[PDB]
Each structure stands twice: as structure tokens, then as C-alpha cells.
Amino acid sequence: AIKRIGNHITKSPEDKREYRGLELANGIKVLLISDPTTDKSSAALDVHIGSLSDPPNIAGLSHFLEHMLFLGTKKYPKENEYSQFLSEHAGSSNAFTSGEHTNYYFDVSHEHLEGALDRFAQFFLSPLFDESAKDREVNAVDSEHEKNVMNDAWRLFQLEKATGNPKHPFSKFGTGNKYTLETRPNQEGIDVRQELLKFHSAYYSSNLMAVVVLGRESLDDLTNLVVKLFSEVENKNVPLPEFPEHPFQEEHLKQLYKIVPIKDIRNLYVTFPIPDLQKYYKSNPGHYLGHLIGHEGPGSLLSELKSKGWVNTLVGGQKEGARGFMFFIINVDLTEEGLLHVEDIILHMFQYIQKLRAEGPQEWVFQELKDLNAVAFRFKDKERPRGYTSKIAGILHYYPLEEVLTAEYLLEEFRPDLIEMVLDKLRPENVRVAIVSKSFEGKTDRTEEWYGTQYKQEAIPDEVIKKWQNADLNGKFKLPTKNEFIPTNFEILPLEKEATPYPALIKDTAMSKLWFKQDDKFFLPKANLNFEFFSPFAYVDPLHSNMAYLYLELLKDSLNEYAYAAELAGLSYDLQNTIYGMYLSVKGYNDKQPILLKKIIEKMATFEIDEKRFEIIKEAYMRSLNNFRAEQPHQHAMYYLRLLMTEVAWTKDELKEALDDVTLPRLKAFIPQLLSRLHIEALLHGNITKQAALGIMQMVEDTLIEHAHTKPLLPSQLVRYREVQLPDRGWFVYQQRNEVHNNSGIEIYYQTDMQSTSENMFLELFAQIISEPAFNTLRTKEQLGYIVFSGPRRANGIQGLRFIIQSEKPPHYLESRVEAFLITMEKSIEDMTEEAFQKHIQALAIRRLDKPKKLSAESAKYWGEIISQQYNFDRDNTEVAYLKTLTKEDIIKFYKEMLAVDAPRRHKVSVHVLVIQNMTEFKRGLPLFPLVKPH
């Protein structure tokens, strides 16, 4: 069977890997993909035979056969070298069956395909089906059934098979079970092995199999090896029509079911069947209709239901079963008010559909989606060496090899009649109601035989379907407007003649500080800009902190609807509450980035607050403070220690005492006062000319003065918090009691001077050195508690070591175990050889020296340095050279004089959650560490 159709196929312009797809004479679909650059190589074979099978003699027989092909019969398990070969090359394979097809994906570390190809070739060429082999597989199939029984996702899927026509084979149980696999046939007289013989000979031989290779070897090398071992397999010319007609006969239409799952969750499913329409996939109309249903802009279906509160989340998507029959599914979130108004929610979905009928199909919205799809296709992302093979192999059976890459990423034709046809399908006549709730338990007397899921399948008497058809009226909903920003600039701006390896202060003003960088090591239009706004009033009072959070929470919630279109564009807006300042994150294509940024600045400068929105936000904030009372001790201990470190902090109980007097008028008065004085810090990044970037900073500051009347902060109005000074000679402990968790939590912390390049290295190295032994004994052999923490702490320009442990043991006993660990580590570091110490520092050095994998990640490192005010972008490169210089003797000295129990400079503090009688008095007594000088 030697054949190779030849074509040159276009691929994402950015993508470099070259692939040739060919068809053999036997008719096996063949795809050859060559990627020499990637070290890993792979291959996949998909047979289009599902768990559902035309013979109904036993259930799970097809699933058993796919398992029988990965068992390796008796020869492959007998060879431990075969399994060792997979382990040596770090190759992990997953074998699974789906109703449409059975799929398997495997990987080899480098050029190990030849041996693997032969092993896979043997199963198809000749399966032994030995008696000893069958014994292991039947037990494995029974184990596979066990996990499926408790899987709620599978339980919904099997319920869909039950809702299938009983006469139709669609209602067969795909997973199968041990009793069906062996006990049921032996009394019947059917032989399982004889069936496996017949099925492999004809069904596997038929051309339902597709082979793809991701091997790094050249396409010509790929062609010779793949063709020789797949030429032997022949064609039995057996045609499979799947299911010609939909199983449903309208008998199970217009029925309401109540499902109680093991998990507590509430989802509503309305079932409507739909026609295949596979040939016209250019328009993809059903998904386009789903996008309109799932949209969250002006006059959205979810937006009305959000005001009612009946549906928190609405998602609409196409559902595909067999090629012959497909379905449309709408999922709505269920709320207690929504459960009472279930019928009204169903009518409201019809009202949006009525609006869609009135507007009709629209060419412009389809064109906008096509433009977005083209942009996404051109900039392909998250390419995967493993699992990509399985997806393409399934696509190959239904799609031509040349068109597989662009089939789902491009729209080429408009199909108005198809949009009308899917709209016609969405009518109450075809509607089926399925409701999931824990409360339904005890109202259901009917239980599924396969899995323990209870659905009444009761036939609604006095059906209200007629009322919904009779009362249909044009919806108040309005179709969404054209997206304001669509990326049109794909060209990357040329690098500036001046080259800077790190961010530079192109513009410095009292009003704002401006850091600028140009893209290097990456070639994408995508550019990201982070801006910090700092105002003193936010942290001045406990009332001020509470009011500031409410304003910021309200700000993002109001902007969320306006920024849904930005999410579709890929632009990213983030508004978050930080005690010192407000963090605005803008990410995405550079060309449309400024328009979104300015609109956010105007909304931030002048914000309107609704009383109803304020009340719900205030209630949610109050509930969160109540939750912390029942929160886990280890996090509670971490908060208690953090509260002591800051010069002044507000107790969580105090924060929820002083929310009693909070009012809307005080909050509205606060917004101009806070906005009136603030300072802007800038971290622009990506490919842009410096002059244009300076202009973008100028407009942002100009808008803020124009609306908020923001004026530059006076000197000394920008001071960081100072950590309390430790005694250096004493260990201090206070006790508090948890109410809900039986494990007692103790936290021990050691302050370590002030941040310095050498100081950072010493703390990091000590944490690295003790981490592996603590995991070896404290975490596992002692197993005092699941939560054991030995990691570095960096805050307020200071370094510390924190031990967060939650265990069912006395806190003092846990502290004694930590003390025993510290003395063991003293002896351990001395016992450890110098060569092992060098291996420790080298592992930390490799971890420190990580090259950026993403444009955003590269910008993030600079963002951290500036917010801390160190401004040391290259600090890691200077530090790694010092780490090699660092010696074992210095590390022993650092612990013996500072962190040791007998150390003269001993900084030890203790926080206990099951004496410091007043937190304020102890903090007032301690001096304050100065802010680190900026570099």
C-alpha cells in the first residue's frame, strides 16, 4: 500500500514546523509532521470505533477491546524491558474510548519512535488474545467502571443515553461492568474472545483509522518508516453509517426531570435536537447563535436575569452526539429565587429568541467574529507536543488533511437559512427540561439502574408549554453594538536605535515617574502597561480602609459589563484593592490599548455609585469577615503575625464593628477627597516609540487633573510602613483559641536584618538547604500535620523565615519539634559534604536564572522591583555571581550568630492559635526599621 498525495499547505505565518499529509493505497489517513527544533517526538493512531457498537450482545466489549490492544497481550507485560524502555524515555501514554472514536496518545523523549512504531504495528498486524492476558484486563476494566460510577460528569452523560430511545442502541451502557463482561456471556454461551477475534479482523481493518507522527525526523524519513509498517494492514471495505435518524421519537419530548447528584450543585438543561449541517461548516451558524445567547453586553439575555438574580451565569453551546443526530443545550445557574421562578426563566429565554427572529440574521456581527477568528488563528498560542496528536487524529476522519488546521479557525461563507433553521429548532415543542438540585431528593422515586442518580422522569401534567408559545412577545433585549476596539495593526514597531537592556526613566516629573522599555527576545505587537496610583487617606482610618474597598469593589463591578467587549478583544483590565495604592493592569494589542486605558481612567476619576449596588456589596464584605472566624488556623496564624509586623494595622473584628455606621453619603464624599491628591507610577512595556509612550503618559495625567483635580503629593506624603524592631535577646509568645478546626496552629518567625543583595542570598540559600530535610522527616516521617511550611518571607523591605504548622499536637510540643529540627539542621549542614553544598547552591542558581517564557512574565519582574522601590532590574544577575562566591563556612556562621537558640542576635517571635496581653502596647514599645534606600 504505497501512495502519497502531494500538496503545499499554508500554516500560521508565525509557526515554523513543516508538515505533509498523504493517503496510502489501503486508505489509512496519514499525516506527517516534522519539528526538528522540539526535542520531544510523538505519534498517534485513532480508530473511529466508539464504546457504542452495532452488536448489542454485551456492554463494554468494544471498550474491553481497546484495553486489550494496550495490554500488550502476555508478551509485552512479560518483557519488563518494554516498560523500562517507556520509563527510560519518560514516555507516558493515555488510552481512552469515546462514542465517536477510541483515541490514544503517546510520546518519546528523542528519536525513540522506531521501537514504539514496531510495538504499535504488532497489535494491528497480529493480536495474540492469550488466556493469561485476558485475566489481567478483565480486572482492569472492572476498576475503570468503579471510578466512572462516582463521576458526576459521566452520570449526566449516561442519563443522556437513558433519555435516548430505548429501542435505539444509543441507550446501551458504553462503560460496561465485570458482570456484563464475563458473568453474563458464560450463562448466555457467548464467547468474549471469539467476538474480539471477529471485531479486530474487520472493524479495525476498515478505513476508520488515522495515523499522525510529530517526529523531529525529516518528512522523507517519516514517510519511509510509517509507510512500510502500515502497508501490511488492508481494507475489508466495510461501510459504517453510524445512526441514520435521531433516536428520540418525540415520546420523551416536553418532559421535566429532577436529578440529585452525589455532589451539591444546581444546573438547568433544556434539550432541543438539531440537524447535522456538517457540510456548511464555513458559517458555523449554531455556535454563532450560542455566542449571542452567551453575550454579556447591552440588552443581553443574562443581563435581564442578573437584575432578577434568578440566573447568576448563562452559557449556550452546540452539543454533538452521533454524526446523524446533534442537539442544542442551554445551561442556566439556579438560585433560590430562580427555582421559584423556573417557568418565568424559560419564558425569558424564548423572549430573547423572539428578538433574534425580529432582527433576523445579521452579516456585520458574523464578519466581526470572522475578523476576531483570523487574528486568533494568525497568533497561534499554547502549542502542545502531547495531546495535539489526539485532537488532529479525530479531526482527520471528518476533515481533509490540508484543511484540518484552518477548519475551526476560519469562516468563509454566510448561511442565513441555516441560522433560520437552528432558530426554528429552538421552539417549546422540542424543549425538554432537566433540573439538578439537592433539595429534589425525597421527591424522586425513580433511580437510574447503571449509576445511583435519581430522576423522576415524571410527565408534567397540565403542561405549560402551550402558554409559552401563546404568550410569545418581542423582547426588550437589544442586539449588541459593534466592538469599539478591534486590532488592525499586526506590524511590530521597529526597535529604537538607542538600546536599553532594562527599563529607563525617559520622563521624570513631580506629578508622575515614567519607566519605559522596548520588546526584546519577543516579536509580538502585544504590549502591557501597569500604572500605580498612591493616596494617603486610604489607610488613614479603619473606616477609610473599609470605604476604599467598597468603592474599588463597586468600581470594577460597574465597569465589568462595559469591559466584556475588551475581554473578547483580548485586552485585560484588572482593578484590585491594595492598602498603599490602586493597581490598574492593562494588557493586549498595543494599537487598541490606549482607548480602553483612557475610558478606565475617566471612570476611575469620576464614579457614580447606586444605593442598591452599594447595599449588596456591603453585605458581601460583612459576610467575608464573618467567614474568617471559622477560617483555617494556619491562614489565621499567618494573618495574626502579619498584623503585628506592620506599624499600624486594623483588627478584622474592629473592621466589622465599624461597618455599622458606614453610609452611601460618606462614601460618595470620600471619592473626590481621595482622588484630589495622589501620585502616579508608570511601568510601560512592549514595542512602541519612546516619544509616543511619553505622550500616552501625558494624556493619562492630563485627564486625571481635568476630572479628579489630582495634584502632586508633597514630599514625606509617600512613606512606607516600618516593621517593629525585635528584642534580639528574647522569645515572646501569646495565645488565642480557634473554634472550628481540631488541629492546633503555632507560627514561629525569625526577623533577618534588612533587605540587601547578600542578605537576600543568605536567607534564600538557608531556606533551600533546610527544605529537602524538612520534607524528608518533619513533613513525612513525623507527619505531625499535613501543613508544614519552611519558606522565606519578604515584606516592608525586610526578610524573615516563617514556620506555619497546623497539627493535632500542643503548640509548645510543635515548637519543640521545630527547635529539634533547627539543631538537626546545624549538625546536618556540617555533616553535608562541600560538593553536596555546591550542588545545593547550583540548583538554587538554576532556579534563580530562569529566562522569561512570556512577554508578560518579563514585564512582571520589573514591576516587582519598582513597587518595592528597589528599582534593581538586574539584581538577580548580580546576585547569582555572588551565590557561587558564597561558601559553606559563612552559612554556618550566619545561623550560629543569628538564628541559633544561643545566638547573641536572636530574633525569635511566637504566635499561637489553639504573654502579649495588648498587641498595641507591645508594638508601641518596639522601635521602627527605616525604609531601604532606593537604588
Next chain:
Amino acid sequence: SPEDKREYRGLELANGIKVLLISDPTTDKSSAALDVHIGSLSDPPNIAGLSHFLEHMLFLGTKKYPKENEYSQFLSEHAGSSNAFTSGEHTNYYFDVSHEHLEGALDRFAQFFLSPLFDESAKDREVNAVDSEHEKNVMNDAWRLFQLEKATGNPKHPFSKFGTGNKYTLETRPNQEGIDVRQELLKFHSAYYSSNLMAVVVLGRESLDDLTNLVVKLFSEVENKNVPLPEFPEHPFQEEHLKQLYKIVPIKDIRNLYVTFPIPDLQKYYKSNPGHYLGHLIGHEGPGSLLSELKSKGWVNTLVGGQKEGARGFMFFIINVDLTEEGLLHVEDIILHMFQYIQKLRAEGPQEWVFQELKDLNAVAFRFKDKERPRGYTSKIAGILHYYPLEEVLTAEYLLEEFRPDLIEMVLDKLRPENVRVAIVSKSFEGKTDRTEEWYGTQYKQEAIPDEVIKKWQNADLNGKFKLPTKNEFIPTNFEILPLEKEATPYPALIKDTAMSKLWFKQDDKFFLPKANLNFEFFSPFAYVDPLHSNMAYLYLELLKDSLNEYAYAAELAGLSYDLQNTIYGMYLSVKGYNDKQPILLKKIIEKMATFEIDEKRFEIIKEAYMRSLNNFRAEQPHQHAMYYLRLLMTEVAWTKDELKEALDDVTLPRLKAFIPQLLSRLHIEALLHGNITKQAALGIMQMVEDTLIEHAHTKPLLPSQLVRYREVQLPDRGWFVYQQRNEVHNNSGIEIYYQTDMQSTSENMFLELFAQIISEPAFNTLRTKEQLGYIVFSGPRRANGIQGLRFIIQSEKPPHYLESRVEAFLITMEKSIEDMTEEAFQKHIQALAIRRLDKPKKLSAESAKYWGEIISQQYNFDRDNTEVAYLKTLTKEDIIKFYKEMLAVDAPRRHKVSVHVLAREMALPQPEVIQNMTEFKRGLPLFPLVK
């Protein structure tokens, strides 16, 4: 007065000399005074200021020793001050002596009468000295106005005669005329001093009889000529100057309106003292008062009116009026307003109750005279001894027991448009004044107001909008003292502890005074948060004090007092005085501050005044600037005058109104109870103040985290810091060097203070007396943010590095001096320091203020001094050397040194550590722990 001791014994000599005998055992210092009814008016007309020249001549008269200063050296031996002055009709002498040396001092004074030398050499030196005194008086703006007033009434009248005297008039014109001035002194002394009207008051303690026997025999040595007293029948003005406006140029920038009314000698009758009673009416501030009308117009900030001094036959009445730019434009209207108040007084008429209430307040207050200074008491008594016996003068002058409604009507009738003599003092009269007084060079001009305007004043006699003052409480509710509680604590304790309130209580026992003091501090975090926040707080305080001032005047008349201060931590309220209205006054003060209405015009004028203060600091002494720069660093967060000025422009009246409830929304109050108040009653007063606050502002207790104090930057050990600032206004340069040692502790406080005392006596002689580099010299310790430091502040036009090097050399010399000083000399130095620290307060207010300072510092050890003084006694010379070595020493390892350099306008260090940005340095240095 029961509080006053004795003073009720007096004798009159046959010669007519007036003698009063005082014997106070409690008084530790003896005293004696002389007086005689002769004056500048009674000087020979040709001679000028003969009596003033003669009063100096009396001291050197003694022939006992041929030394002019022999009496003065005798007074120096007894350390008793001797001063003498001549009034218009009286010559007064006063001196004091050792307690057991009263007889010896009197004998020396007696020698002057037996032989008055008045030597020729003494006269030649005296003429120059008297002329020098006259020259110093010319610069005084007030004196130049007074001299012009005496001369203007009549050249012929003796009223015009010069009082001070000058060398040319005293000696040069008589000597050329062939008159011998020394012979004139001898003849004048026999004719007037020795002849009659002498008044001697003697204070002794050994016995009343011992002084009495000696004085009668010794003061009879002079033979009386029975010479009578000079009297003037009519006022000097002949009515030629009446209804005549004057414009006078003043040396100082002062604007005043003066009107003179000649009146009869009502004071000589002393029946009712009517003129002062009328003056109180005009002075009183109340609804419908003259000051309230003037303040509303804004023409006059304040006015003062008291009966002017008058001769035997006549008296004068004058008004002093502050003038504003708008007031200067409307001066005629202001005089018309004064006339309108007089017409309202005519409509009300004389009222017995107003006189009775004033008399009742005076009588109770006369019984309650807290203290009398022994020195100068004799001099005041000598003046009134001639006209009234002490018992009669004290009772009549203080409470006016006799009442005459007719006399009150007569003085009101005496004030009239015809009686008015007009004068205006303003700085806008330069170049408009031609006439110049010869003696003081004062420039004044006659600008008679058009006769038609004078007719307008006469034809306009209508009351405006004036309301008779409401009767107030001038009587303490209980004159007696409430009994001390059965359980009593010598030092105030925390009787009541509350989340919103802190209470300390002591009842004054030894003092036995009905008067009591209550101190309250209000805490607000927002006051120090921003330069704008500090600025608005001052404006609110200034608006509050102006608004409630009219009510407060009534308490001031009763002797009750209130204080409002803008401390950075929060508002300060203090109430001191009798308990009769003290609880009532406290509630009203709280009501005004917590709920307040702001007048826009008052806010604008207050805002301008605060802005004027900020620009004023640019022109300030260089040494004062150095203290201000050091203060910024010591207080950590603080704001410069520049940023405050921009913030002051930002403040607006609506913003200020919004901030007052926010400031008053949450407060913490700490209180001190002192004086005659029952503990249970005081607890009720504490409940009342908090209850008033919660109703008015819904006050809530501050959270412990919210309530915090400031911290101080910590200098590195072995570190020297300096920064340079330039003062454009002052030619000289001021340097302040601050050496920090440690957080204040009992041992630490004693050691540094001992060092400051040890070097204080040497510093004055070694630097100011010998080096004499600059007038400004300071060697004193400074306490801020619970940290002890020593500051040396010198202002001189000398190089700063040279001056700092001299300071370092002085310290090295002081270390050598400490070794040189004997152990006994060191013990004497500690003894002086111990006495200075152990000083008992002589007033109820002083001891309570000492307790108050500890409470604001957050240290509750009231009796800290007794423990500290015991430690000071244990101190050794070696211990001070160790303290100098650890921090004060130049090369000390733990030494912390900060230098503030204010450069001169037109104008090195071994180690230079210039501070470019203060904010960067504040971030760089750590913060000292707050004291526990």
C-alpha cells in the same frame, strides 16, 4: 484682708510726716519707703525737672562716709534693691534690707536728713545721667505723646513744666545766669523735702515696737517749716484747645484715637469713685455693647477706657481706641458711636444694682487677696498714706462702700461735645504735621474738624442699638472650703478609668483656696495628617475663640479663665477659677466648639492673618531659624512654612465646615481635677462633659491602634551630621548643635542636666564674658519626643566652622575643667541644682501645671522629682566624666551628633555630612521607641 498680715499700725508725727508700721513675721525680707508731696509741677518755673534730679541726689547726701556709693555698697551687702522716682506732685523713695538689719538701714537714710551733701562732683555726673535718662525716654513712642499732652494745655500753667529734666535746663542755663545748682539743691531740700509732707512706711519682722521707737525719734530730726501742699484750682486748658482735632505722628506703627475731657476732682471726694464705674460700662463687652458694634463694623478690634490722672482741683477722662484701615476712614463715625453709647447710658440712668454687684465682687475679692510682693508694697502705701489712712484707702479704693447716684449722674453730665478735646494718632500722618515738641521731637498738627461737623456732633444725640449688660455671677457659691474627703491621696490617682475618659483627682489642702483648676485634652488623629489639615485646624480654633469671646468676658470679670490651644494631637481646653460658675462655664464652652457656625468675613480675616504669619517667618532671628529646623527632625513628620502657605490657599469655608464634625466624631479626653472640688462632684462634672459631647457630636472612643504619638529619628553611633540653610534677612549667622544621648530615664535625666548645670556657670564667663563672639549665647538641655539632647545656639557675624571649632574647644576645656574642679566644688554645684529642682509652687495653678505636663507626656509618676533629687545627690565627679566620654566626647563611639547651620546672608568642618533631601534622610534613619 485676712490673707494679708498686720499692716494696721500707723503714727502721724507733729511735723506732719506720715508713718505706717508693718510687722510681718512670715515675710523674710525687711523694707522701708519715703515719700514727699513735691513734684515737677511744683519745680521752679525756670528750672526743668529739678525734683527728679534731686531724688537721685538724696542717696549720696550722707556725710557718714566720703563715698557717694557708700549707701549703695551697704545695700549690696544686705542684697536689698533701692529705686526712687518723682511723680507729678510727689517724690517717692523705696528700699529693702536684711530681716534683722532694718534698724541699720533706717539709720543710714536718717544720715541724709542730718547732712545732705549734694556734692559738686556728684552734681556734675548727675546732670549728664538725668539728661541720658531723658534721651532714652525720647525713643519711647508712648513717652513722646505724654510729654506733648502736658505742654499743650498752657505754656503759663505749671502743667507744661518738664518732669524728667535735661542737663542744659538743669545746669547750663542756671550756671550762665550765675545761679549755683548745688546751692539750689540745698535750699530746695530744706524748703520742700525737709519742710513738710514726708511719708515714710517701714516693714519689719522682729517686732512692731522695735521699728516704732527708732522711727519717731529719728524722723523728728528735721524741723518742719509747715510748708503747704501745691494745689491747682482749675484744669490747665482755657477751652482754647476744646473742640480742636489733632493729628500726631507716632515713632511706632500704632493707630489710636484720644479725646480728653476736663472733669472735677471726684477722686478727691472718694465717695463713689464714679468715673471708673462709668468706664467699666463702656469697657464691658455684651449684647448691645460699644465694642460689639465696633467689631461688627470691623473698624475697631478693641478699646480701653479708664479715668486719667488728675491734680488736686481737676481730673481728666480719656479713651484709647485701636484703629483699622476701614476705621481710619470712618474715624468720625466711631466718635459718633461713642456719643451714642453715652446717650444710651443717659436713658438707662445711674443704677444701684450695677454698682452693688461691682461692690460685692470687690468686697469678697478684697477679703481674698492671695499675695503681696514685700518689695514695692511700702512705696505704693507711702503714696496713698498722705491722702488716706491705710484702712480707709484700702476699703474705699477696693469696694467703694459709700454710694452716690448723683456723682455718677454728674460725671455722665461732664462728658459732653463741648468738653471733648480731640487728637488722632496714625502712621499715615507723615508729612502732614508741622508743629514739633522741643523736648521729645514729637510731630503733631492742628486740623480743626469743620465747625459744621462739630455742629453735626451736637445736633446728633440719639442712642443707636445698645443693650444694658445682663447681671452675671460675680460671687463664689461657697466662700467656705468643702471638707477634705476621709480617704485622701497626696498625689492625684486614676479615680475613674473609662474607654473615652481618664480621670486624675487631688483636692488642694494646704492652700485652703476656694479656687480650683480643671484641665481637659481632646485627641484627634486627623489634625496632623496633612499640611492642609494642620492649617484648617488653626483657622477653626481662631474662629471659635473670636465667636465665644463675648460670653467669656463675663467669666474674666468674675476672675474665671478659659484657654483654647491647637495642639497637633488635638484641641486643648483648660478652666481655672472659682467653682461658682466653673461647671456652667465648662458646659457652654463645649457647646460652642462641638456645634459651631462660621462667619465668612471672620474666616477670611483669620485666614489672611495666618497667611501673614507664614510669610513673617522669612524675616526671623537666625538663631530662631536653627531651632525650627532642628524641631522638624525631632518631631519626624512635620510641614515647612512654604508647603503650609500653598495649603492655606487651598482651604475653603465649605471644606472647613465639613471637617469639623469629622474631627469631633471620635475623641479621647484626659482630665486633671485640682483645687477645692469634692471627688463625687468632680465625677459628676466628668460625666457632664462627656454627655454634652455625645449629644452634640456623638463622640466615640478611639481604638488603641488609632491612638498613637510621634517618634524621633535615631542618629548612628560615632556619627556627625550637618546641613546648611541661608537666612536672607539677617546679616549674622546662627548655629545650633544638638547632641542626643538616650531615651529619657531617671538616671539619664540627672546625668545630662548635671553636665548642663556644671558647664552653665563656666560657659557665661568663658564664652559670652571673655570670647564675646555674639550677644546670643545658650547652654541648656532640650526635651522632645521623650529624648534628652544638649543644644548650643550662638548667633554672630563670624565663620560657622570657626564658631563650631570654638564650641568643640570649649567642650575639651570643660573636660579639663571637670578634672580641675575639686570634689567639694562639684558637691556645691549639685546642691544648687537640687534646690532648683526642689522648688515648691507658691500658687495653685503652678503645681497643677506641673502635674499636667507629666500627663500629656504619658508619664504618670507625679512625684518623679523626689526620687530624681536623691539620685542627683549620689552623683560623683567620675560618673559625669563617664557620661561625657560615652556621648559628649568628640571621638565617643556611641556619640550621636546633629548640627543645624543657618548661614549669614553675605556668608572648614573636619567631617562633612551635608543633608541634600530631608525626606531621604528621614527614610534612611530609624525611629526611637515610644516611652512605656
